[PDB]
Amino acid sequence: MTDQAFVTLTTNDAYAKGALVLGSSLKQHRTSRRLAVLTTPQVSDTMRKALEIVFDEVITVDILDSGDSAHLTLMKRPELGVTLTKLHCWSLTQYSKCVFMDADTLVLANIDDLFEREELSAAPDPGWPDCFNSGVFVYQPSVETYNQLLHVASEQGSFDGGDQGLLNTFFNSWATTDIRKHLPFIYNLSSISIYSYLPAFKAFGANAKVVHFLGQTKPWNYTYDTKTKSVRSTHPQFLNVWWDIFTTSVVPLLQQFGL
Amino acid sequence: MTDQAFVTLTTNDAYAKGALVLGSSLKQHRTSRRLAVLTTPQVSDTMRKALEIVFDEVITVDILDSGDSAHLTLMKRPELGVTLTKLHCWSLTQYSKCVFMDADTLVLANIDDLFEREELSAAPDPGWPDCFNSGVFVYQPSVETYNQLLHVASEQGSFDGGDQGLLNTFFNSWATTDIRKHLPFIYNLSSISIYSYLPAFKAFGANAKVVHFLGQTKPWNYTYDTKTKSVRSTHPQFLNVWWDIFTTSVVPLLQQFGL
Numbered sequence: 001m002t003d004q005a006f007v008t009l010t011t012n013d014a015y016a017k018g019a020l021v022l023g024s025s026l027k028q029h030r031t032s033r034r035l036a037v038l039t040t041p042q043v044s045d046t047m048r049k050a051l052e053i054v055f056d057e058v059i060t061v062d063i064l065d066s067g068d069s070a071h072l073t074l075m076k077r078p079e080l081g082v083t084l085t086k087l088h089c090w091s092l093t094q095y096s097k098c099v100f101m102d103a104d105t106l107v108l109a110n111i112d113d114l115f116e117r118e119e120l121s122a123a124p125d126p127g128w129p130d131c132f133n134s135g136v137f138v139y140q141p142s143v144e145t146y147n148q149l150l151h152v153a154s155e156q157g158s159f160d161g162g163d164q165g166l167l168n169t170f171f172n173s174w175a176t177t178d179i180r181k182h183l184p185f186i187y188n189l190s191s192i193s194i195y196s197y198l199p200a201f202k203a204f205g206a207n208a209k210v211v212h213f214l215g216q217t218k219p220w221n222y223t224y225d226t227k228t229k230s231v232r233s234t235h236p237q238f239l240n241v242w243w244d245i246f247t248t249s250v251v252p253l254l255q256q257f258g259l
Numbered sequence: 260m261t262d263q264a265f266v267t268l269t270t271n272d273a274y275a276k277g278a279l280v281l282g283s284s285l286k287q288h289r290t291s292r293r294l295a296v297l298t299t300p301q302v303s304d305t306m307r308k309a310l311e312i313v314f315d316e317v318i319t320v321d322i323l324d325s326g327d328s329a330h331l332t333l334m335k336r337p338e339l340g341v342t343l344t345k346l347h348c349w350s351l352t353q354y355s356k357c358v359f360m361d362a363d364t365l366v367l368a369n370i371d372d373l374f375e376r377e378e379l380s381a382a383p384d385p386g387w388p389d390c391f392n393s394g395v396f397v398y399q400p401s402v403e404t405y406n407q408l409l410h411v412a413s414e415q416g417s418f419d420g421g422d423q424g425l426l427n428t429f430f431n432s433w434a435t436t437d438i439r440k441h442l443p444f445i446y447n448l449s450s451i452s453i454y455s456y457l458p459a460f461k462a463f464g465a466n467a468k469v470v471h472f473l474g475q476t477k478p479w480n481y482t483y484d485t486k487t488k489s490v491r492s493t494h495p496q497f498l499n500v501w502w503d504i505f506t507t508s509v510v511p512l513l514q515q516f517g518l
């Protein structure tokens with residue numbers, strides 16, 4: 001399907017590693033869809049070149065440029081920089097439907113069945129489960145929606161200073177409307193929940209389709225022993241999957257640009 | 260409405276305080292429904308007498324007795340004692356529909372509109388939000404359902420050793436079926452979330468209808484200064500509401516049995 005895409009975002013090189021692992025994981029699980037990544041000019045040439053290989057489409061978004069539609073909102077609400085960049089996912093009108101996935105997620109299984117879903121479909125956020133988590137969502141690119149989101153960003157901002165507040169505000173019927181727009185939690189499994197509610201993880205986590213690495217320590221912030229194939233220090237399985245992909249697929253890819 | 264009830268449970272005197280505050284809070288917000296409390300013989304005469312005043316119905320459940328239907332399951336799965344006692348809420352066939360509320364919840368607003376809901380309606384659990392939280396739920400008393408729950412308890416137990424695992428297992432279509440069976444989070448607002456996702460609380464928590472005091476430190480485990488009208492040590496508003504009711508309504512009630 002050429003009209004549908006997984007879309008991620010990286011604003012820097014550290015999250016490009018995430019993007020690259022995410023993109024690799026989607027190919028690993030044989031997505032039939034396109035892979036698109038939003039990048040900023042802060043993403044270096046080497047990461048960018050690796051992104052051009054992993055992703056079918058690399059889109060540059062520069063909200064620091066006055067030519068950007070979001071730039072005015074950025075001036076007004078500088079804290080929303082990343083949010084505003086992410087919102088450009090709606091500008092990808094070459095696609096009829098996309099699954100947005102943050103660069104700190106990881107695909108463990110084919111999730112092409114998400115394209116059955118409508119905008120706005122997302123998994124509940126743990127913590128405040130009447131908000132959906134904005135790490136993974138099904139949306140329809142539309143200039144109009146983009147404009148409407150930008151407008152909300154400008155007028156109200158984000159109740160949480162991030163994209164999740166803004167998205168929840170805009171798509172506010174999610175909690176109370178249409179159970180199909182609740183993606184199963186396994187499609188955006190918060191890495192925190194994999195110890196916060198451990199009995200639940202043991203009961204339902206073997207079914208995890210997507211892991212969302214939350215907390216301040218991102219996967220790339222870990223040390224990974226390539227001999228023991230495990231990250232160093234508490235349930236590292238997913239970190240280890242991430243690092244296996246990073247070591248197996250991403251690093252050698254990055255390395256070939258040295259020549 | 261004489262055929263509908265809020266139903267809580269107390270297995271001991273500490274949770275009877277919770278029950279009493281919960282029952283008082285429901286009257287404070289002018290429920291038109293009956294108030295029922297499941298008690299065990301471990302609840303002392305004084306708490307029991309206070310329960311007889313706050314609640315319209317005080318039901319004694321003694322799963323330690325061989326005459327109890329749950330007793331055999333208790334022998335088999337001793338960890339489920341409290342769960343099995345709670346399951347007797349389904350035995351309350353004098354009511355057509357009930358809202359079960361754990362004794363560690365607190366009503367902040369009339370929630371009689373829960374009786375519009377069907378079994379099984381519950382709020383999402385934070386942590387694993389594709390489970391519902393068993394602190395507050397709308398159910399239909401039925402010997403059959405009780406028997407079926409007991410049977411599941413016996414055969415599979417609880418994936419989390421508590422009632423929530425068992426209830427989620429039995430009512431397992433909740434995550435993926437019927438958005439109306441998702442109670443808004445404000446009807447079972449986890450006290451943890453009131454700091455775990457603080458931006459969300461600031462955005463949506465003023466709407467809280469029910470607070471669910473989770474964590475090991477229950478409201479009665481706090482020290483309350485009756486002069487400053489505040490608990491001692493981090494967002495104590497709800498603790499303070501609980502203690503205000505406890506101080507204002509429950510304690511003087513308890514005291515009158517000294518004579």
Ligand SMILES: [Cl-]
Pocket residue numbers: 177178179180436437438
């Ligand atoms: Cl629905």
